[PDB]
Coordinates of C-alpha atoms in Angstrom, one line a residue:
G18 CA -13.8 -4.7 -15.6
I19 CA -11.8 -7.3 -13.7
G20 CA -8.3 -5.8 -13.9
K21 CA -9.7 -2.4 -12.9
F22 CA -11.7 -3.9 -10.0
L23 CA -8.7 -5.8 -8.7
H24 CA -6.4 -2.8 -8.9
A25 CA -8.9 -0.7 -7.1
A26 CA -9.3 -3.3 -4.5
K27 CA -5.6 -3.6 -3.9
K28 CA -5.1 0.2 -3.7
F29 CA -7.9 0.3 -1.0
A30 CA -6.5 -2.6 0.9
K31 CA -3.0 -1.0 0.9
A32 CA -4.5 2.3 2.3
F33 CA -6.6 0.5 4.8
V34 CA -3.5 -1.4 6.2
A35 CA -1.4 1.9 6.2
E36 CA -4.2 3.6 8.1
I37 CA -4.5 0.9 10.9
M38 CA -0.7 0.5 11.2
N39 CA -0.6 4.2 12.4

């Protein structure tokens, strides 16, 4: 539910930023 959603969102956001920063 919420915690899972938020953790998944963060993990995606961290990868997204890592990708554009290279």
